């Protein structure tokens, strides 16, 4: 398994295409009826920064909960004592470029537990093999993953 390169993404297309994570549905606010499609994620083998204290980093769509939990296993298996860490999940306002899949609970910004950036690329690969419909080596500080909606 050869880790993803800096600023590389798979598939090699835009995030919101049929081949990728799919078109943007809309902003899923709290008072929005579609909110209940976002259930919290309590996988003990995952570290959520939750710097907002709101626990919004755990809220995600079913498909995302599947890919994530599947990725959290690869991580522990790849590097002993190293778990999957999520810094950002579903957001409730400006913090990402509008039309973002973070507003829908379809996107997750992840890193390793030890923050050792040397594996951020291998993590991105394990994400692609985990099933995520679009993994992107966003920055040197974290990788960005996203899935499709129930509309697939």
């Amino acid at each position: 398994l050869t880790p993803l390169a800096y600023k590389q993404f798979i598939p090699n297309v835009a995030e919101k295409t049929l081949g990728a994570s799919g078109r943007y549905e809309g902003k899923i606010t709290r008072n929005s009826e579609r909110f209940k499609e976002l259930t919290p994620n309590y996988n003990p083998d995952i570290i959520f920064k939750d710097e907002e204290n709101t626990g919004a980093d755990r809220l995600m769509t079913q498909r995302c909960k599947d890919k994530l939990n599947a990725l959290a296993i690869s991580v522990m298996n790849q590097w002993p004592g190293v778990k999957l860490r999520v810094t950002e999940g579903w957001d409730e306002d400006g913090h990402h470029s509008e039309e973002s899949l973070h507003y829908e609970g379809r996107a997750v910004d992840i890193t390793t537990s030890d923050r050792d950036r040397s594996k951020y690329g291998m993590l991105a690969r394990l994400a692609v093999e985990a099933g995520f419909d679009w993994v992107y080596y966003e920055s040197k500080a974290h990788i960005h993953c996203s899935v499709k909606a129930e509309n697939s």
Binding site: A5, Y6, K7, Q8, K49, E51, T87, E88, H95, H96, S97, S100, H102, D109, T111, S118, G121, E138, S139, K140, A141, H142, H144
Partner: protein, 417 residues
């Protein structure tokens, strides 16, 4: 013992720095925060028409480091007429574009020839940068501060620069068209699929104007960038070893020279007017207090000496003489002269050659595409050949097959023969 400054021109408008082109015109280009670039003839005349007008593209603001940051003329500006400017635009964006003087008016850049190199995301308007400058190898350096962007930020936010707080270094001289710039082999992250190739070294935060020594006394060093970072204020310097192919970023050398207090910036004096200043670092603060730094071939220690004589920035003419920009719409430009010498020693003289219209082969007959700083005519979609005259066909012509009008081959019969 004591230096003197003389006024060159008052009534300026938020000046941030002064520089020269190096084409014999001895013009003094004045950068203005708002987004203007005024010209000043050696004798002291100012031009009615701005050399660069982009106050619409740049977001100024008073307080806030947003606005016109830096500018750097390409070494071969006399031939290719290339220049590179950085500024904030839309929080906002620190952009670094390449412009090209008009082939009709050597005193005004063609705004159509704009060509963006870097677009850096910014969340605050402090610790920005964005000093531009060329090195002895001709490579372009871009000093960007951390822009108040924390690690947490870059870890939980998408679409952040990842160049902030680092010194970038890219080769603008390329015979390539699919990219604005190429990465120097000398770079630490050349051919690297794990880190940004643009980054040479990082560690900066809030760097003022960083002094540049182009002829370091150290034989094994070809260039040195001394920055007065106020973060608890220290001062880090960048070493660029001669003939070294970096395979990993160098560490910024950290040392605490300056007595005490914040500093606007510094510079190295490579002038002819003064002898007792040649090779000295000169850093000053916004109050008007200056100092001089100097090292040692051995022991490599530093010494601080007071320089006897608000500050917005420094300048330098084509002849090496340094200037001081001081303070709306009332900025002034002061020239630094050494009383122990005439205002113009006979050895400092240099006949003035006014700026002339470009003549390079490329800029002479290059249509449908732009010219790289290396005189190459890069063809725009739908053109080929040395100077993009040979028409493109889609589908291309088969049996020769001379393409002329829009996708209309010239055979045989048919659209493509």
């Amino acid at each position: 013992n004591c230096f003197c400054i003389q006024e060159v021109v008052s009534g300026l408008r938020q000046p941030v720095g002064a520089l020269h082109s190096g084409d014999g015109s001895q013009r003094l280009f004045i950068l203005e925060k708002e987004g203007y670039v005024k010209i000043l003839t050696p004798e002291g005349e100012i031009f009615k028409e701005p050399y660069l007008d982009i106050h619409k593209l740049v977001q100024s603001g008073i307080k806030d480091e947003r606005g016109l940051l830096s500018l750097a003329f390409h070494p071969n500006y006399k031939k290719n007429g290339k220049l590179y400017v950085s500024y904030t635009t839309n929080d906002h964006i620190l952009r670094v574009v390449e412009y090209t003087v008009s082939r009709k008016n050597p005193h005004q850049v063609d705004l159509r020839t704009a060509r963006v190199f870097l677009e850096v995301a910014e969340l605050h308007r402090k610790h920005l940068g964005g000093q531009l400058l060329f090195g002895p190898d001709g490579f372009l350096y871009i000093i960007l501060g951390d822009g108040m962007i924390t690690l947490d930020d870059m870890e939980e936010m998408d679409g952040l620069s990842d160049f902030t707080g680092s010194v970038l270094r890219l080769d603008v001289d390329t015979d390539m068209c699919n990219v604005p710039y190429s990465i120097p082999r000398s770079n630490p992250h050349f051919n690297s699929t794990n880190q940004p190739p643009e980054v040479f070294a990082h560690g900066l935060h809030d760097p003022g104007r960083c002094a540049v020594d182009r002829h370091p006394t150290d034989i094994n060093i070809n260039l040195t960038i001394l920055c007065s970072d106020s973060n608890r204020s220290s001062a880090r310097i960048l070493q660029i070893i001669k003939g070294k192919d970096y395979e990993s970023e160098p560490s910024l050398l950290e040392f605490k020279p300056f007595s005490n207090g914040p500093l606007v910036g510094g510079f190295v004096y490579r002038g002819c007017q003064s002898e007792r200043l040649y090779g000295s670092y000169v850093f000053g603060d916004r109050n008007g207090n200056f100092l001089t730094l100097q090292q040692s071939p051995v022991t490599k220690q530093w010494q601080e000496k007071p320089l006897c004589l608000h500050i917005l920035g420094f300048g330098e003419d084509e002849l090496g003489e340094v200037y001081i920009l001081s303070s709306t719409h009332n900025g002034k430009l002061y020239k630094i002269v050494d009383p122990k010498r005439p205002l113009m020693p006979e050895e400092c003289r240099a006949t003035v050659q006014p700026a002339q219209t470009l003549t390079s082969e490329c800029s002479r007959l290059c249509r449908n595409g732009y010219c790289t700083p290396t005189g190459k005519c890069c063809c725009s979609p739908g053109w080929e050949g040395d100077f993009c005259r040979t028409a493109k066909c889609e589908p291309a012509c088969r049996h020769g097959g001379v393409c002329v009008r829009p996708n209309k081959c010239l055979c045989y019969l048919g659209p493509q023969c």
